[PDB]
Amino acid sequence: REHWATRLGLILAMAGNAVGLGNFLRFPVQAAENGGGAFMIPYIIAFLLVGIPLMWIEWAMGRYGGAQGHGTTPAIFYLLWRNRFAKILGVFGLWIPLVVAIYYVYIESWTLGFAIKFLVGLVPEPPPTDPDSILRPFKEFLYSYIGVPKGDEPILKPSLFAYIVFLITMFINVSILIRGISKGIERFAKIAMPTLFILAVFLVIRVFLLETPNGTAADGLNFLWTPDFEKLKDPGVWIAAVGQIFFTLSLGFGAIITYASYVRKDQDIVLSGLTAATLNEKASVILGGSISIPAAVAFFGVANAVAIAKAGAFNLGFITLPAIFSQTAGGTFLGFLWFFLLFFAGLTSSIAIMQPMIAFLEDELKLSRKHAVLWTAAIVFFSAHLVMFLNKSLDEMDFWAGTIGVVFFGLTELIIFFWIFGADKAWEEINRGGIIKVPRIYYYVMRYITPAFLAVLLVVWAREYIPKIMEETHWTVWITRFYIIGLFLFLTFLVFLAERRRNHESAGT
Numbered sequence: 001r002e003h004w005a006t007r008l009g010l011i012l013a014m015a016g017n018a019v020g021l022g023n024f025l026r027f028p029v030q031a032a033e034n035g036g037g038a039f040m041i042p043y044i045i046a047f048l049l050v051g052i053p054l055m056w057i058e059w060a061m062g063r064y065g066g067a068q069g070h071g072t073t074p075a076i077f078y079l080l081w082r083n084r085f086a087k088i089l090g091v092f093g094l095w096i097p098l099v100v101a102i103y104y105v106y107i108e109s110w111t112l113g114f115a116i117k118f119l120v121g122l123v124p125e126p127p128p129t130d131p132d133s134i135l136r137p138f139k140e141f142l143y144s145y146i147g148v149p150k151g152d153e154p155i156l157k158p159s160l161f162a163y164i165v166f167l168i169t170m171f172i173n174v175s176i177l178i179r180g181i182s183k184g185i186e187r188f189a190k191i192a193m194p195t196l197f198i199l200a201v202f203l204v205i206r207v208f209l210l211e212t213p214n215g216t217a218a219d220g221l222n223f224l225w226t227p228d229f230e231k232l233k234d235p236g237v238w239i240a241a242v243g244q245i246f247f248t249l250s251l252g253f254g255a256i257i258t259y260a261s262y263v264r265k266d267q268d269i270v271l272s273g274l275t276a277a278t279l280n281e282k283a284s285v286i287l288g289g290s291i292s293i294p295a296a297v298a299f300f301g302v303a304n305a306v307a308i309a310k311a312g313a314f315n316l317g318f319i320t321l322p323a324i325f326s327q328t329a330g331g332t333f334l335g336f337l338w339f340f341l342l343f344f345a346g347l348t349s350s351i352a353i354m355q356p357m358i359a360f361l362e363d364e365l366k367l368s369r370k371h372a373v374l375w376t377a378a379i380v381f382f383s384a385h386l387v388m389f390l391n392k393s394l395d396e397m398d399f400w401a402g403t404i405g406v407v408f409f410g411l412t413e414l415i416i417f418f419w420i421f422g423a424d425k426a427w428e429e430i431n432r433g434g435i436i437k438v439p440r441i442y443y444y445v446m447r448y449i450t451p452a453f454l455a456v457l458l459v460v461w462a463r464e465y466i467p468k469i470m471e472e473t474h475w476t477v478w479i480t481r482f483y484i485i486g487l488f489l490f491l492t493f494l495v496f497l498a499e500r501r502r503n504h505e506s507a508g509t
């Protein structure tokens with residue numbers, strides 16, 4: 001089996017795994033929609049009560065599984081719980097990263113696409129003061145690119161350039177993943193990460209220098225870092241904060257697990273898991289949070305920033321922020337740095353969410369790494385046409401695999417590892433090989449607090465939120481719903497073939 005070559009590569013591969021588009025696109029929207037400083041409180045607690053503990057658990061499962069030649073959850077879930085239902089529950093660990101991959105890679109490609117058009121200076125030319133005459137040319141720039149519907153039909157019509165950049169993007173993902181852990185994901189993570197850090201620093205600095213009749217970047221920082229204890233009681237704020245902790249630290253995607261399974265059996269995972277998590281939360285709160293919001297608040301003042309955040313998720317990153325940059329000298333280049341930064345951030349995270357399925361085709365179905373990568377690209381590339389041409393298809397997947405799936409799977413891997421497998425055997429397994437050990441208090445946060453926190457979350461969710469989505473959506477949602485349910489049975493079928501081949505291989509030995 002393959003292993004990470006250096007302690008550094010591993011840590012940067014894991015930090016690039018987590019540090020993605022969620023840090024620079026999702027976090028900003030989420031923190032502003034949810035009252036700025038009023039979101040930061042739950043977010044910090046959630047990081048201490050859910051974030052860190054699950055990070056460790058997944059590394060643990062990962063290294064544990066990897067040692068015995070398995071890097072995915074259908075296998076590993078069976079090793080922790082010798083039951084047929086563990087393989088099935090373990091499927092979600094290939095399903096989630098696959099579905100998410102299907103729409104992540106596409107979005108990631110956009111940034112490449114925009115990155116290229118801003119470099120070359122093929123970008124809208126806003127008429128040099130009216131906020132709309134400026135924002136509109138860019139709304140149309142995005143709307144043309146991805147192909148937003150103009151009439152009554154839920155049909156996206158992607159530009160050709162977009163489509164072909166989606167090919168290159170796939171190609172670029174494959175060229176890394178096909179070289180493997182150490183010579184691919186690892187070699188790349190050592191270049192990407194520093195680059196990502198520099199670009200973001202440069203942007204953060206340049207943004208801090210923004211001033212307008214309407215404010216300064218400072219006002220954005222205040223808005224973001226001013227406590228509002230009159231929300232703490234809002235369950236929407238806690239479901240917001242926790243949903244953001246998961247996505248950002250790649251928990252419940254089975255990606256941490258799969259990566260971790262390339263960690264040598266003896267290698268520490270306590271100081272490593274802790275370093276990777278702490279990297280993702282700096283990049284998140286220090287960098288991601290100091291680019292979008294400050295710039296928006298500095299040009300529009302807070303009241304309008306918030307209104308934009310709520311407008312959509314991509315309004316800020318793909319429309320507002322470029323439009324703002326366009327009102328500054330070389331703001332086109334700056335735009336390119338902005339998108340070139342996003343790209344690398346989405347590239348390092350998309351290679352991560354595609355490795356689970358790969359690791360399964362090699363591990364369980366004994367395919368070469370090459371065929372594994374190729375087929376995994378074909379499944380994602382084919383399926384991505386759904387996302388490309390079906391309006392709000394992305395939104396549906398991001399909900400079932402990227403929102404509901406992750407939380408349910410997180411609680412699930414926690415209940416299998418710490419409750420079924422064994423709390424003590426889990427503790428012993430997490431701490432084993434550590435450079436540092438785990439704060440004794442955390443044992444009790446993992447065994448009682450965490451699972452009760454989440455369990456409650458999911459309960460409120462299934463009551464005060466999910467009924468609206470099942471009933472108040474358009475009818476096309478049932479196409480994607482049909483498709484991603486179809487993917488699950490397919491995965492369920494390979495898990496079936498894999499256990500069969502194993503039976504034939506045990507008999508033939």
Ligand SMILES: CCCCCCCCO[C@@H]1O[C@H](CO)[C@@H](O)[C@H](O)[C@H]1O
Nearest residue numbers: 147157158159160161163381382385
């Ligand atoms: C392998 C599965 C293929 C199924 C259908 C392929 C559709 C390709 O369609 C292409 O996409 C672009 C985006 O709008 C357009 O620019 C092109 O004119 C079009 O040929």
Ligand SMILES: CCCCCCCCO[C@@H]1O[C@H](CO)[C@@H](O)[C@H](O)[C@H]1O
Nearest residue numbers: 113116122159160161162164165168
């Ligand atoms: C990284 C390289 C990507 C290049 C792919 C070219 C995409 C083809 O796109 C075409 O180009 C023209 C001009 O820009 C437009 O007039 C056409 O409407 C468009 O279909």
Ligand SMILES: CCCCCCCCO[C@@H]1O[C@H](CO)[C@@H](O)[C@H](O)[C@H]1O
Nearest residue numbers: 147156157158385386387389390479
């Ligand atoms: C459920 C998802 C199905 C994806 C199949 C999409 C097939 C591509 O469809 C084609 O693409 C072009 C661009 O919009 C159009 O010019 C063509 O008229 C259309 O035939």
Ligand SMILES: CCCCCCCCO[C@@H]1O[C@H](CO)[C@@H](O)[C@H](O)[C@H]1O
Nearest residue numbers: 154155156385386388389390391479
């Ligand atoms: C479910 C997602 C799939 C979206 C595909 C959108 C493509 C729209 O393409 C349409 O297809 C028809 C059938 O060949 C043609 O008769 C139409 O002229 C054409 O506009």
Ligand SMILES: CCCCCCCCO[C@@H]1O[C@H](CO)[C@@H](O)[C@H](O)[C@H]1O
Nearest residue numbers: 048049437438439440441442445449
């Ligand atoms: C509710 C979760 C809070 C997490 C913060 C934990 C900080 C570490 O806590 C420390 O770790 C040591 C080992 O267990 C103890 O010896 C110390 O008394 C303690 O101060």
Ligand SMILES: CC(C)C[C@H](N)C(=O)O
Nearest residue numbers: 018020021022248250349
């Ligand atoms: C699906 C994961 C790779 C997402 C990643 N943690 C991000 O914040 O973008």
Ligand SMILES: [Cl-]
Nearest residue numbers: 027244248284
């Ligand atoms: Cl985050």
Ligand code: NA
Nearest residue numbers: 019345348349
């Ligand atoms: Na990333």
Ligand code: NA
Nearest residue numbers: 018019020248
């Ligand atoms: Na992240």
